[PDB]
Design an enzyme around this catalytic site. Structure first.
Site, mmCIF file in Angstrom:
data_model
loop_
_atom_site.group_PDB
_atom_site.id
_atom_site.type_symbol
_atom_site.label_atom_id
_atom_site.label_comp_id
_atom_site.label_asym_id
_atom_site.label_seq_id
_atom_site.Cartn_x
_atom_site.Cartn_y
_atom_site.Cartn_z
ATOM 1 N N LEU A 51 43.431 1.223 -28.835
ATOM 2 C CA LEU A 51 43.289 2.491 -29.215
ATOM 3 C C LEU A 51 41.748 3.174 -28.844
ATOM 4 C CD1 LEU A 51 44.341 2.147 -33.158
ATOM 5 C CD2 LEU A 51 45.804 3.005 -31.091
ATOM 6 N N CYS B 60 35.511 -2.017 -32.855
ATOM 7 C CA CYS B 60 36.531 -1.352 -33.444
ATOM 8 C C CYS B 60 37.365 -1.784 -34.266
ATOM 9 C CB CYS B 60 37.301 -0.380 -32.226
ATOM 10 S SG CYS B 60 36.236 0.686 -30.988
ATOM 11 N N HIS B 61 38.297 -2.687 -33.669
ATOM 12 C CA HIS B 61 39.337 -3.364 -34.553
ATOM 13 C C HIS B 61 39.260 -4.816 -34.635
ATOM 14 C CE1 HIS B 61 41.509 0.447 -34.478
ATOM 15 N NE2 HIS B 61 42.423 -0.131 -35.206
ATOM 16 N N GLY B 62 38.829 -5.652 -33.398
ATOM 17 C CA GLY B 62 38.693 -6.987 -33.382
ATOM 18 C C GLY B 62 39.258 -7.761 -32.285
ATOM 19 N N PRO C 188 43.950 -7.504 -31.610
ATOM 20 C CA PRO C 188 44.954 -6.686 -31.329
ATOM 21 C C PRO C 188 45.443 -6.034 -30.179
ATOM 22 C CG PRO C 188 43.313 -5.537 -32.490
ATOM 23 C CD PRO C 188 42.649 -7.069 -32.303
#
Ligand code: JHE
Lengths: 196, 378, 46, 99, 65, 59, 444, 415, 74, 239
Positions: free
Chosen positions: A142, A160-162, A175
């Protein structure tokens, strides 16, 4: 009577070839057509030459302008980046990561497991020279900017997410669907690289 | 039997462009209709291609037009074709109208009136086109010309600020001028088709002004081949300008960006408005000047009613011929005077030329027709 | 397969007679015959 | 009477005669003229048809007749006058009756 | 270093059209600079001289470049 | 032998299929000929003025 | 008993020649009746401008008496033996022939000889037959067919003797003296230019001896200056448009230059013309006709009538078609007709050529039926070909024509060639020559 | 293998005749007693439609197949009507006779006459009539018969205007089924063997069977304003097959029966000379002779200037009166016989006309009379017989017909 | 309105040649040049006088504007 | 307010098919660089524009590297200064017009990108202006700093004469006279305003030749088709 009608003299207008009233026009028929159709054929070749150029220019208009080609490519100096350290650059409004890799990072990313990866790519087909890895610094899930020399797999990590990228830029644990992007490039002089 | 006359779409094309019965004797002045169509198509293409690179924001506008000329591939040849193409359009228009006047084609009332509409629409298009580059003459030209509508009593001042979308010619004006300028040529195309639709009710007039039903030839090949030759010559004229003197018919002041402080020396519209610009400046009163500039174009609508001669064409009419060529020479004088500063002797010449324009149309050429009649015992 | 003595049209203006030399042969001497065909134009005889 | 000098000048200046046209061939066809033409006898109509055909063909070539063949001012018969005069005289009667 | 410009400006200055215009310039030079208090100047006469001079200069300056 | 124009007609121009292939071929040969020939005329007219002519001085 | 066989046992044509050069030709069968006559290489093509229509003028005077049989004596004698006396003139062939009882052949040959050689040409009879021709010329003006064909020649072969009409201009008819007619006769009516043809119950040997008895006096030498030798005739791609709106139907006649008598291609061209064929409004066929031109013409009422032709002269001819149609149909007729020529040139099929062959086989086998057409075939074939061509040989030339031949032959004469156009009547629609000429090729 | 005619009459009434002559072409004709005379006042013009109606769909072949199939082999199909007979004829190269024969049999023995096809064909009656009536001879001869008879032979060959668009499929069926029968049919052939024709006629032309013409004397007068007046005046002559008929045929050639020389003045024609003596302006006159099973008409046909019609007709009538009074020498009657003898042989010279005479005789008589027997019967006419024929005409009840500007054309009772 | 329904014409013959039978430029200079001069002479003193007048009103007005911008000797 | 318009100098590119003297452009660039670029902007010309015109790719890279330019922001959020590249445009002297006025006593030096196109007379005008600075005539003086030039409108300009003999040494060793320096800089300013010049004219020649071919051919096609009608004879033959 209608027998009184005799066709006017057309000699003033006639082609030389058909002036002789005692000779058959059939001799000259092959020729007279040839001359007139040559004019037509020549004309069409001229119009083709023109229309080709006109169309071709208009088509050219829509292709990339001089100022967009000017930002197409970026030169990078290879002696300006030390062995191990990452160096970021600005390319097509994106970060662009160039990384000098150590003989440890080379051998350690060479004999990794091929299958275990989410996007299976070997290291000798991700790069052109083994000691240099060139990648776009946009996180594939993303869109973030990954931070160098961190994470679990010791390469690039994203807060951000991992996501965890290795030293070859391949996603290991996170992800992200497809690895960090390998751009189009070539080494020119052994001191310089052009990306684009 | 053929699928030229049978197929619903080919039938229209076969009748308007191939089997159309045309007079045997039409001259070179009949080529200009064909050429106006070509001009229109030419503007649309070049225009559309320019619109792919232009922006209507006041800050970026001038820069985008120059970016076209310097960085876009062959953007220069597109840009200057479009600007000289607009000149070629107006040359073609005035030749086309002159033909109509001289040979009395205006008796085809519907065709003629739609003509007047077409003229006015091409004018509106070209006025708003010249604004888009956003140079000095663009900005200051638009300011002076628009602001003439404030001379209308009660409402005029509102009307001006409504076109502008503000208190001067600025951001909102340029953007809407781009929108109107894009759409109008398409409207022209439609009106041009109605124009021909009425023309083909009667078929064409000819130089004699005498009915040609006894000697019609089919349009193809005779006039298809003439029109090709004409188109070829039109491309020569255009490209002679584009490749050898692209700046010839324009103005230098439109190469410095628009400055709302710094006024240019002698502000003027593009060459094809200068005759009517001179008529405006003849009259000292401003509302009077606007009504004169209005009547200098709309008088075209009046021409058919003013016809007095028992003959249709000016071919057989010496007095009219001279007065016609006087009217042409006068218009050439008004174009000259329109380009000049407001001073002696250009004021007096301009007044005298403007008097002569309306005098020729409203009094002298009608009288001349009736003199000619009475000379023929008519 | 052979076309007839006279090709027939309807509504086509009639052919004149001006002298004795063209008018003899016309006076009917035997009763009428009528042919119609597939190939040959339709004729009416004396 | 005295303007016959100018009428003769104007005639040749106008120059429709150079195409072998008579004055009444050059008349602009309105609804009256159309009707007047329609009332011409076979001979006068076919003459008109030819004279125009000839003029149009000359116009097409941008040429004129030989000077011997030009329409002579004095020999220009006003062939359409009697028909056109009556066509107009008739219409004016209907226009009167319509009030 | 001699400029080809200033050489040619001299060469052109000694022509009949120039010298006649140069005298027109010198007339008003010692007419206005001799008289007191008149707001008239001598721009016009200078420009008459330069028009004739620099027209000639143009015709052969570019040879030396 | 029949005339030149006649040979041209029978061999190239009679069948409309051959007439068209002739045009397409001829247009290629013409294009390269015309371009190369006209460019020569231009570059001779502007000898030593173009970058193409002064390129060698800085390479 | 097959068709191929039937052709082998058709009666042969006998061919003998006299001292002076007169050819005697004969076809025999046991028949009670016969036809015999004289065919001559003489007509409008051999006439100059000053004496045009002389051969036609003569034709009128031929049966008006002789030196041996003055006035109506020639007439009386033909009538009282039940004989039928007849003549015709084309642009190249004048011909006099007699249909008689077989037993009366000696007298028949005698009378023909008396007509040709000893023709009275009386002063009063000339001035009488002068007015007769003028009235025939007026009748001819009322035949649109005749007018359009005379026009076709006049424009097609313009500025030559082939442009000239057989009957001559009225100027010549009104002025031609008896001096002109006798000069014309002695120049053109010569033994080597002439053929005596006969068919019916006739022993060839007898005819030849009868020719000796009566045609021996025929002159067969020409003097130091001049020997009749036709120049070739220049065909011109041209149009003649006689616009006459007062007439109720339009006649159009259109043709390309044909090859002329000699050429073998004439056989393949006959096959092609048979394919396209002919039509009029009384034909039984209609929509279901074989010819696409005819079926299209019938279903859409384009024309009232049409025929293809192929007219042969010496070193040239007229190959095309004539049609008669409504004033609104001329454009569409032309379109379909020219469309047919193009289709045959480019893409003729085997089965349709076979049909054309079969039509032509039938055409010339059944045309040669009765003594008169066979006598005429003998007379004229000897002038045009130099021989009678047997039916067996025609059949061999016909079997040789296939789809490939029809294409190649038609392409030679029709494809991308300038036609001659003649139109007469309400021809406002009649396509412009450029549109007609552009209709002589396809863009494919 | 030198050949003369063969002949058969089957027990069912039908005649077959055929000369195998080994020509390349073969003509076959089916002759039927089904001419215009066999119409009544309820089905007038049916035979005219029937004449146009071959190549409509049959049982064994489509409308399309009849046309395409015949044209495929270069052939021809003709249908010919007199007042008394109809004649269906096919030509082709001899290899295709059995193809054309199949078509001929389909057309005549089994036509379908479909309502949509028959309706579509109705306008063709108007076209065909219109064309034919461009000949003014057609006006006069059709009127002449209508004047001269009360019923049978009075019928016109062409459909009356009022019936055009109204001839029904039923009427066409009725007409064929009632008139196209073995007892009324003769199948003639050239260039085909007699045995194979016989077998076709036995197997395909065996189908089962199905008023006298009263002379009236009248006149019919078409006023139309032509500058020329066509006119015919006849009296009842004799029936074909009687010996008296031969006398009329000779009288016809004594008086003058059409031209012998091209552009000729007709020096032996008794009528033409009689008329040309008094009036020199453009004209034509001929003796008219029709001859039928029941009856016949003999007289003369004039074409004269409008004003001269009175003079010409009376001049012509007077010439017959002098022949009837006895003014007639052997040299005249010898000349007339030589004409008729030659004319007959010349009419059967072509294989087309020969077929017409073979079939013609086969219907009106039992069998074929050879040319030699016919010429002997012409010679059998004495001078006395010719004078009786003329006398019969002069005192016989008259029928007349005219077309033109008739202002000076007399009536019968003015003559 | 289609060809065939334009108008009524009677007794007018038109002769013409195929474009392949004739030359594109017959007597192009021979007859062309004199016809040009005839056509030029015919319209010259209708067309020209106004444009002479323009030239004069123009060149007068131009150098009148120049003179007016100079100083006057007084 | 009388007016002296410039004379027409015989430029190396004056003619219809005459190209620009590219060496003259190379000198002229240096006259902008050394003299103008501290007063006038030229916003539409970048260092890449010079390549294939007056300098090589490598020479133009060197010229670009020589100059300062602002770039950013970096990850810190700051605007830094960097060595220039081909993609950078010729840098403006001041940050804005208001700053420019202050440095030149009120007068704003115009941008030179289009100066040849944006002034009547073009390179003839500019050359006359640069070389036409002279001593004022008697009766005349302006505000302290407004100089006398006879070619400038209103006879007085607020630009110090910028060129004189040896105001720079040229790379190719051409003697730098005032005349030579003006001629060169004008040739560059011509190219600045109209880069298309040389292509435009190449196209012109090819168009003139193509038209030379096509026009008489199309005219011949016209006469061919029309020859049916041009030849035709009419005759009126009533009954
Ligand atoms: C229709 C006619 C054309 C004509 C006009 C234009 C074109 C080509 C063209 C060009 C642009 C074009 O664009 C648009 F938007 F559709 F209008 C459409 C067609 C062809 C023939 N000429 O030349 C004429 C000349 C003389 C007399 C009558 C006509 C006459 O009646």
């Amino acid at each position: 009577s209608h027998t009184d009608i005799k066709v006017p003299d057309f000699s003033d207008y006639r082609r030389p070839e058909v002036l002789d009233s005692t000779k058959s026009s059939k001799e000259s028929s092959e020729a007279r057509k040839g001359f007139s159709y040559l004019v037509t054929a020549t004309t069409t070749v001229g119009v083709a030459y023109a229309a080709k150029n006109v169309v071709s220019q208009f088509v050219s208009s829509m292709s990339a302008s001089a100022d967009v080609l000017a930002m197409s490519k970026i030169e990078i100096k290879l002696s300006d980046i030390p062995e191990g350290k990452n160096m970021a650059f600005k390319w097509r409004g994106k970060p662009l990561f160039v990384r000098h890799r150590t003989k440890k990072e080379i051998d350690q990313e060479a004999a990794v497991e091929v299958s275990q990866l989410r996007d299976p790519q070997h290291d000798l087909e991700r790069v052109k020279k083994p000691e240099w890895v060139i990648l776009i610094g946009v996180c594939t899930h993303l869109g973030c900017v990954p931070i160098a020399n961190a994470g679990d797999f010791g390469g690039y990590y994203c807060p951000c997410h991992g996501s965890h990228y290795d030293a070859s830029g391949r996603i290991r644990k996170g992800p992200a669907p497809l690895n960090l992007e390998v751009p189009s490039y070539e080494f020119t002089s052994d001191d310089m690289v052009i990306v684009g | 039997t053929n699928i030229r006359k049978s197929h619903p779409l080919m039938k229209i094309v076969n009748n308007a462009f191939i089997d159309l019965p045309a007079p045997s004797n039409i001259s070179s002045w009949w080529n200009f209709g064909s050429l106006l169509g070509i001009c229109l198509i030419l503007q649309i293409l070049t225009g559309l291609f320019l619109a792919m690179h232009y922006t209507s924001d006041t800050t970026t506008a001038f820069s985008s037009v120059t970016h076209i000329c310097r960085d876009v591939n062959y953007g220069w040849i597109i840009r200057y074709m479009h600007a000289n193409g607009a000149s070629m359009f107006f040359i073609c228009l005035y030749m086309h109208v002159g033909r109509g006047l001289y040979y009395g084609s205006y008796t085809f009332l519907e065709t003629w009136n739609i003509g007047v509409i077409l003229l006015l629409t091409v004018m509106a298009t070209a006025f708003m086109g010249y604004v888009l580059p956003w140079g000095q003459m663009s900005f200051w030209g638009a300011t002076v010309i628009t602001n003439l509508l404030s001379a209308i009593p009660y409402i005029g001042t509102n009307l001006v600020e409504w076109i502008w979308g503000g208190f001067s010619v600025d951001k909102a004006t340029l953007t809407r001028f781009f929108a109107f300028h894009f759409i109008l040529p398409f409207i022209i195309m439609a009106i041009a088709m109605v124009h021909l639709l009425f023309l083909h009710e009667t078929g064409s007039n000819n130089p004699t002004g005498i009915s040609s039903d006894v000697d019609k030839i089919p349009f193809h090949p005779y006039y298809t081949i003439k029109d090709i030759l004409g188109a070829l010559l039109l491309i020569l004229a255009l490209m002679l300008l584009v490749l050898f003197a692209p700046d010839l018919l324009g103005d230098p002041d439109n190469y410095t960006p628009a400055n709302p402080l710094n006024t240019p020396p002698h502000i003027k519209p593009e060459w094809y408005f200068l005759f009517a610009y001179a008529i405006l400046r003849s009259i000292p009163n401003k509302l009077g000047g606007v009504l004169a500039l209005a009547f200098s174009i709309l008088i075209l609508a009046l021409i058919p009613l003013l016809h007095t001669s028992k003959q249709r064409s000016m071919m057989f009419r010496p007095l009219s011929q001279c007065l016609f060529w006087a009217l042409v020479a006068d218009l050439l004088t008004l174009t000259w005077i329109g380009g000049q500063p407001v001073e002696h002797p250009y004021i007096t010449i301009g007044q005298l030329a403007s008097v002569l324009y309306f005098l020729l149309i409203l009094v002298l050429m009608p009288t001349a027709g009736t003199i000619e009649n009475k000379l023929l015992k008519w | 397969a052979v076309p007839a003595t006279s090709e027939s049209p309807v509504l086509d203006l009639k052919r004149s007679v001006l002298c004795r030399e063209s008018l003899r042969g016309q006076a009917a001497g035997r009763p009428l015959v009528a042919s119609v065909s597939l190939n040959v134009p339709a004729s009416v005889r004396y | 009477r005295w303007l016959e000098g100018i009428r003769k000048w104007y005639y040749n200046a106008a120059g429709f005669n150079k195409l072998g046209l008579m004055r009444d061939d050059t008349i602009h066809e309105n609804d009256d003229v159309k009707e007047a033409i329609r009332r011409l006898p076979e001979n006068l109509y076919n003459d008109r048809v030819f004279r125009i055909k000839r003029a149009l063909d000359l116009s097409m070539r941008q040429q004129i007749l030989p000077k011997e063949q030009w329409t002579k001012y004095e020999e220009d018969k006003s062939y359409l006058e009697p028909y056109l005069k009556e066509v107009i005289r008739e219409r004016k009667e209907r226009e009167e009756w319509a009030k | 270093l001699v400029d080809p410009l200033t050489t040619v400006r001299e060469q052109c200055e000694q022509l009949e059209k120039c010298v006649k215009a140069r005298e027109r310039l010198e007339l008003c030079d010692e007419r206005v600079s001799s008289r007191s208090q008149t707001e008239e100047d001598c721009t016009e006469e200078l420009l008459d001289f330069l028009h004739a001079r620099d027209h000639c200069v143009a015709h052969k300056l570019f040879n030396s470049l | 032998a029949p005339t030149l124009t006649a040979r041209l007609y029978s061999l190239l121009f009679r069948r409309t299929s051959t007439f068209a292939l002739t045009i397409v071929v001829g247009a290629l040969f013409f294009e390269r000929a015309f371009d190369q020939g006209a460019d020569a005329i231009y570059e001779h007219i502007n000898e030593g003025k173009l970058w193409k002519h002064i390129k060698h001085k800085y390479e | 008993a097959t068709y191929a066989q039937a052709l082998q046992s058709v009666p042969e044509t006998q061919v003998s020649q006299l001292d002076n050069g007169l050819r005697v030709a004969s076809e025999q069968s046991s028949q009670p009746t016969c036809t015999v006559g004289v065919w001559i290489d003489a007509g409008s093509r051999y006439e100059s401008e000053k004496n045009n229509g002389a051969g036609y003028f003569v034709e009128h005077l031929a049966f008006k008496g002789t030196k041996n049989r003055p006035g109506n004596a020639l007439e009386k004698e033909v009538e009282s033996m039940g004989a039928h006396l007849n003549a015709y003139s084309t642009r190249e062939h004048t011909a006099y022939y007699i249909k008689a009882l077989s037993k009366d052949l000696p007298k028949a040959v005698e009378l023909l000889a008396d007509i040709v050689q000893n023709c009275s040409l009386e002063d009063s009879q000339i001035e009488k037959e002068r007015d007769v021709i003028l009235q025939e010329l007026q009748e001819n003006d009322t035949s649109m067919r005749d007018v359009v064909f005379n026009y076709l020649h006049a424009t097609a072969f313009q500025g030559t003797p082939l442009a000239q009409s057989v009957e001559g201009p009225s100027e010549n008819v009104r002025k031609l003296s008896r001096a002109d007619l006798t000069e014309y006769l002695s120049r053109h009516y010569k033994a080597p230019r002439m053929v005596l043809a006969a068919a019916g119950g006739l022993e060839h040997r007898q005819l030849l001896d009868l020719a000796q008895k009566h045609f021996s006096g025929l002159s067969g030498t020409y003097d130091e200056e001049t020997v009749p030798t036709l120049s070739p005739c220049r065909f011109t791609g041209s149009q003649i448009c006689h616009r006459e709106d007062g007439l109720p139907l339009a006649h159009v006649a259109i043709a390309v230059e044909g090859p002329g008598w000699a050429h073998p291609d004439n056989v393949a061209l006959q096959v092609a013309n048979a394919i396209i064929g002919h039509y009029d409004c009384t034909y039984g066929g209609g929509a279901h006709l074989s010819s696409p031109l005819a079926s299209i013409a019938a279903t859409n009422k384009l024309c009232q009538s049409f025929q293809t032709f192929n007219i042969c002269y010496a070193d040239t001819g007229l190959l095309g078609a004539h049609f008669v149609c409504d004033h609104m149909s001329i454009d569409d007729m032309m379109f379909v007709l020219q469309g047919q020529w193009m289709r045959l040139c480019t893409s003729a099929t085997e089965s349709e050529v076979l049909r054309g062959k079969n039509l032509l086989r039938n055409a010339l086998v059944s045309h040669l039926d009765g003594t008169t057409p066979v006598c005429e075939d003998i007379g004229r074939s000897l002038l045009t070909y130099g021989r009678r061509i047997p039916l067996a040989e025609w059949e061999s030339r016909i079997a040789e024509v296939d789809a490939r031949v029809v294409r190649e032959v038609c392409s030679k004469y029709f494809y991308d060639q300038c036609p001659a156009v003649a139109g007469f009547g309400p021809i406002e629609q009649l396509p412009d020559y450029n549109r007609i000429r552009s209709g002589m090729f396809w863009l494919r | 293998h030198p050949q003369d005619l063969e002949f058969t009459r089957l027990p069912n009434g039908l005649v077959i005749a055929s000369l195998e002559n080994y020509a390349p072409a073969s003509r076959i004709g089916l002759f039927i007693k089904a001419g215009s005379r066999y119409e009544n006042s309820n089905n007038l013009g049916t035979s005219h439609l029937l004449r146009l109606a071959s190549s409509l769909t049959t049982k064994g072949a489509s409308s399309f197949k009849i046309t395409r199939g015949i044209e495929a082999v270069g052939g021809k199909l003709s249908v010919t009507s007199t007042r008394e007979n109809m004649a269906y004829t096919v030509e082709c190269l001899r290899d295709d006779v059995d193809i054309l024969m199949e078509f001929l049999l389909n057309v005549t023995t089994a036509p379908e006459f479909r309502r949509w096809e028959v309706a579509a064909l109705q306008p063709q009656l108007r076209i065909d009539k219109a064309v034919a009536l461009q000949n003014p001879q057609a006006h006069v001869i059709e009127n002449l018969h209508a004047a001269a008879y009360r019923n049978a032979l009075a019928n016109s060959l062409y459909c009356p205007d009022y019936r055009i668009g109204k001839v029904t499929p039923v009427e066409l069926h009725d007409y064929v089924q009632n008139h196209f029968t073995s007892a009324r049919m003769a199948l003639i052939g050239l260039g085909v063997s007699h045995p194979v024709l016989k077998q076709v006629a036995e197997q395909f032309l065996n189908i089962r069977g199905g008023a006298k013409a009263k002379y009236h004397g009248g006149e019919i007068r078409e006023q139309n304003g032509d500058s020329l007046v066509h006119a015919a005046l006849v009296a009842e002559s004799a029936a074909i097959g009687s010996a008296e008929a031969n006398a009329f045929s000779v009288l016809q050639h004594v008086l003058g029966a059409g031209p012998h020389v091209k552009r000729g003045s007709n020096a032996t024609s008794s009528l033409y000379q009689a008329v040309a003596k008094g009036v020199h302006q453009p004209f034509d006159v001929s003796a008219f002779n029709a001859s039928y099973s029941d009856s016949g008409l003999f007289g003369f046909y004039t074409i004269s200037q409008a004003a001269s019609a009175g003079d010409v007709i009376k001049a012509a009538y007077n010439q017959v009166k002098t022949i009837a009074q006895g003014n007639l020498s052997n040299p005249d009657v010898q000349a007339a016989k030589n004409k008729l003898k030659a004319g007959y042989l010349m009419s059967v010279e072509s294989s087309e006309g020969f077929l017409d005479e073979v079939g013609s005789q086969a219907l009106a008589a039992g069998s074929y009379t050879p040319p030699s027997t016919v010429l002997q019967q012409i010679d059998a006419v004495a001078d006395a017989d010719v004078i009786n024929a003329a006398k019969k005409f002069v005192s016989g009840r008259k029928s007349m017909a005219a077309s033109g500007n008739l202002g000076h054309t007399p009536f019968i009772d003015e003559l | 309105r289609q060809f065939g329904h334009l108008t009524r014409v009677r007794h007018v013959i038109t002769y013409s040649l195929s474009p392949f039978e004739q030359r594109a430029f017959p007597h192009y200079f021979s007859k062309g040049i004199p016809n040009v001069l005839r056509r030029t002479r015919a319209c010259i003193l209708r067309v020209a006088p106004p444009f002479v007048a323009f030239y004069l009103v123009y060149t007068w007005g131009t150098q009148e504007f120049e003179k007016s911008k100079r100083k006057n000797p007084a | 307010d009388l007016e002296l318009h410039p004379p027409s100098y015989p430029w190396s590119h004056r003619g219809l098919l005459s190209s620009l003297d590219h060496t003259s452009i190379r000198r002229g660039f240096q006259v902008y660089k050394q003299v103008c670029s501290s007063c006038h902007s030229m916003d539409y010309v970048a260092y890449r524009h010079l390549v294939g015109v007056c300098y090589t790719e490598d020479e133009a890279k060197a010229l670009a590297e020589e100059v300062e330019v602002q770039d950013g922001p970096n990850e810190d959020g700051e605007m830094f200064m960097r060595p220039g590249k081909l993609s950078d445009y010729f840098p403006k002297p001041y940050p804005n017009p208001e700053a420019a006025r202050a440095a030149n006593n009120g007068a704003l030096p115009p941008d030179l990108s289009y100066i040849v196109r944006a002034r009547h007379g073009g390179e003839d005008y500019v050359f006359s202006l640069l070389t036409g600075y002279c001593e004022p005539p008697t009766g005349v003086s302006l505000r302290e700093g407004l100089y006398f030039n006879p070619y400038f409108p209103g006879q007085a300009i607020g630009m110090a004469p910028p060129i004189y003999n040896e105001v720079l040494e040229f790379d190719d060793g051409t003697p730098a006279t005032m005349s030579q320096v003006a001629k060169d800089v004008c040739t560059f300013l011509r190219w600045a305003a109209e880069p298309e010049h040389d292509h435009r004219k190449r196209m012109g020649l090819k168009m003139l030749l193509m038209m030379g071919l096509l026009l008489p051919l199309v005219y011949a096609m016209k006469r061919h088709k029309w020859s049916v009608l041009k030849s035709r004879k009419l005759a009126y033959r009533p009954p």
